[PDB]
Design a protein that fits this description.
The PDB classes it as immune system. Keywords: influenza virus, Immune system, hemagglutinin, antibody. The complex is a heterotrimer of chains A (236), B (210) and C (218). Helix content of chain A is 8%, strand content 21%. Chain A is built from 3 helices and 11 strands; from the N terminus they run H-E-E-H-E-E-E-E-H-E-E-E-E-E. In chain A, the strands form 2 sheets. In chain A, strands 1, 2, 3, 4, 5, 6, 9, 10 and 11 form a 9-stranded mixed beta sheet that branches. A two-stranded antiparallel ribbon of chain A has the order 7-8. In chain A, strand 7 and strand 8 form a beta hairpin. Chain B has 2 domains: 111 residues, Immunoglobulins (Immunoglobulin-like); 99 residues, Sandwich (Immunoglobulin-like). In chain B, a hairpin with a 6-residue loop joins strand 15 and strand 16. Chain B has a 4-stranded antiparallel beta sheet, with no helix packed on it. Chain C has 218 residues and is an all-beta fold. Chain C has 2 domains: 120 residues, Immunoglobulins (Immunoglobulin-like); 98 residues, Immunoglobulin-like (Sandwich). The chains are: A mainly beta (236), B mainly beta (210), C mainly beta (218). Chains in contact: A-B, A-C, B-C. Chains B and C meet through strand 5, strand 12 and strand 14 of B and strand 11 and strand 13 of C. Calcium ion (CA) binds next to loops of chain A.
């Protein structure tokens, strides 16, 4: 039973920086959360596919946080260190999620983006990428220059093409930017492909895993299954 | 930068265990994971994988080597310290992030007091055709390191000509090199004498007049 | 399971390209990399390149100038080393990555080295002099004098064979802006000199010279 001490699954797997630490390894029956409400998703946004994600992270053999592409060098052409925010701060300084990189413009103009992970070893590779929706076209051009801009995640077993919806949502942690969160899965066959002219929060860390099926005991609101027998009913 | 740093350089007999240790800024553990991978370099030739991910001992490496720690700090440990170890150990690359090498520790091994065994030498003919005159006096196989002086039986400043440099040895302390360097049929006498002093009350080796 | 690099000296601002060679197979897949070792201490990793979807990883003190490539048939990786500062003189260990299992933890092994050297000072092959001598002991301690060479490294082999024992030294740079000088020694049975031939070979690869001369009784 994996049990989080500092936050709900939103921020833990994204790396909100009250989350960080966690526990010792992974093979876990099901998750337990210390539930933040106002505090869960840091920079305000909707987590797409969040409840399906709730149960794929349930019965799991292992896990790996690995450097999908490293923040540093993966992006020759996009300014890789500038996005961090007060919404997701730390030490009073303005931080950002650990497992993704907010990619703002390098020297005003944003070319097509090519990046891809091609898998090899079979384990389920969980890749995550946020999508950012500027408050205004001010918020917009000063980050990703192309005011007409998109995001397309290629798969095989997945495809989606996003697009920012720019408008001023009410303030959440002083932020009228809103972001969106999406998680694909690339199995031993597939070769993932990203690309965009903007509004993409690209993965840094991502996970190799293996599941089975399971769980079932949880909180109302918020192998070892049937075995052979136990030492009573059959042999003695 | 994501940087680690060791418990410096200290030293042990070839008796038994010492601990080099690592301190990583962030946490390099997630878990069932860790990161730090120990490397040893022989002080004067190429790198060696010993312990990787803090725990798993690289097949092909010695048994004595051990390691453990949770996620923030790590420790290397080599229990029955061998004459064979003694080499500049690093701490490594941490996670996958910018990859960073901790910077190392010496590990000096403490033997009995020894020696020197001084050896002198005149310069060769062919150095001398070229105006070169240097005189070499080897110190090899002592312990600890040592104080060397020359006796030309003259009074000049200290006997100048900067010389020395040395090693460490898989099996003892070895070999102080010290040489005097001058010109042609010059010098003075044939007298240049290494007084090699150490923990000994003398070790004279005379030059020759012949 | 093998590794083979090379390069010597550059007059700073020149570009160089370190090769590397693999045998121990399956090269088509693996990640590979270099770590230069700074003198005086040694520091760190200078690039990390992948197997497929070719991706390149660097140090931010490197990132601009270096190009790391590979070939999968002739089966080599390279480092193209560009715009060179005195700061980066090191030796270059070519090294692979043991991944398999999930993470990509680390590198199992690395080639001997190749000392890349950054200077304007022209290459100098070492002057080679012998060293020979009194009271007769059991074992006789001889020597070989190697003087004024640049830059690095140098190799003193005593005719191949009698290299057990046989300590060497750590070159001083006699305060000339170059020209290291190292001193080498045997310890050998008294009854092996004045009879057996004892040679003392030294190779300096950058100046492309290897030499020896019998150290002669006096
Ligand atoms: Ca947590």
């Amino acid at each position: 039973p994996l049990h989080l001490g500092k936050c709900n699954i939103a921020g833990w797997i994204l790396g909100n920086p009250e989350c960080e630490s966690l526990s010792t390894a992974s093979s876990w029956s099901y998750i337990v959360e210390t539930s933040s409400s106002d505090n869960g998703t840091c920079y305000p946004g909707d987590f797409i596919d969040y409840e399906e994600l709730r149960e794929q992270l349930s019965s799991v053999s292992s896990f790996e946080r690995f450097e999908i592409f490293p923040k540093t060098s993966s992006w020759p052409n996009h300014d890789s260190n500038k996005g961090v925010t007060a919404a997701c701060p730390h030490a009073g300084a303005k931080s950002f999620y650990k497992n993704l990189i907010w990619l703002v413009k390098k020297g005003n103009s944003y070319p097509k983006l090519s990046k891809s992970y091609i898998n090899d070893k079979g384990k389920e590779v969980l890749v995550l990428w946020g999508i950012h929706h500027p408050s205004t076209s001010a918020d917009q051009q000063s980050l990703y220059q192309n005011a007409d801009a998109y995001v397309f995640v290629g798969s095989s077993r997945y495809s989606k093409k996003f697009k920012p919806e720019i408008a001023i949502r009410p303030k959440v942690r002083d932020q009228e930017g809103r972001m969106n969160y999406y998680w694909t899965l690339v199995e031993p066959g597939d070769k993932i492909t990203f690309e965009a002219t903007g509004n993409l929060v690209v993965p840094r860390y991502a996970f190799a895993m293996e599941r089975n099926a399971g769980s079932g005991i949880i909180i109302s609101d918020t192998v070892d299954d049937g075995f052979l027998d136990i030492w009573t009913y059959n042999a003695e | 930068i994501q940087m680690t740093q060791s418990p410096a350089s200290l030293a042990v007999s070839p008796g038994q265990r010492a601990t080099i240790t690592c301190r990583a800024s962030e946490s390099v553990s997630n878990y069932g994971i860790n990161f730090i991978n120990w490397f040893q370099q022989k002080p004067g030739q190429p790198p060696k994988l010993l312990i990787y991910t803090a725990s798993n001992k690289g097949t092909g490496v010695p048994a004595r080597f051990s390691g453990s720690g949770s996620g923030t700090d790590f420790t290397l440990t080599i229990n029955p310290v061998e004459a064979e170890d003694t080499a500049n150990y690093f701490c490594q690359q941490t996670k996958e992030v910018p990859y960073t090498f901790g910077g190392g520790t010496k590990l000096e091994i403490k033997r009995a007091d020894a020696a020197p065994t001084v050896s002198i030498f005149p310069p060769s003919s062919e150095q001398l055709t070229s105006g070169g005159a240097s005189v070499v006096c080897f110190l090899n196989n002592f312990y600890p390191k040592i104080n060397v002086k020359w006796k030309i039986d003259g009074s000049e400043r200290q006997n100048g000509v900067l010389n020395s440099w040395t090693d460490q040895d898989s099996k003892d302390s070895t070999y102080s090199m010290s040489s005097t360097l001058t010109l042609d049929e010059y010098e003075r006498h044939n007298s240049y004498t290494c007084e090699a002093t150490h923990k000994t009350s003398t070790s004279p080796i005379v030059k020759s007049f012949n | 399971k093998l590794q083979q690099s090379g390069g010597g000296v550059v007059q700073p601002g020149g570009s160089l390209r370190l090769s590397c060679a693999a045998s121990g197979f399956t090269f088509s897949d693996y990640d590979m990399s270099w770590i230069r070792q700074a003198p005086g201490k040694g520091l760190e990793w200078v690039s990390g390149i992948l197997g497929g979807s070719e991706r390149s990883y660097y140090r931010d003190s490197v990132k601009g100038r270096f190009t790391i490539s590979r070939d999968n048939s002739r089966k080599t990786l390279y480092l193209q080393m560009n715009s060179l500062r005195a700061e980066d003189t090191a030796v270059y260990y070519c090294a692979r990555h043991g991944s398999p299992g999930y993470t990509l933890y680390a590198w199992d092994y690395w080639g001997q080295g190749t000392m890349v050297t950054v200077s304007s000072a022209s290459t100098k092959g070492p002057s080679v002099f012998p060293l020979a001598p009194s009271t007769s002991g059991a074992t006789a301690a001889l020597g070989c004098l190697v003087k004024d060479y640049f830059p690095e490294p140098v190799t003193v082999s005593w005719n191949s064979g009698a290299l057990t024992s046989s300590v060497h030294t750590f070159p001083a740079v006699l305060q000339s802006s170059g020209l290291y000088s190292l001193s080498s020694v045997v310890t050998v049975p008294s009854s092996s000199l004045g009879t057996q031939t004892y040679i003392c070979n030294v190779n300096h690869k950058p100046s492309n010279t290897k030499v020896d001369k019998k150290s002669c009784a006096a």
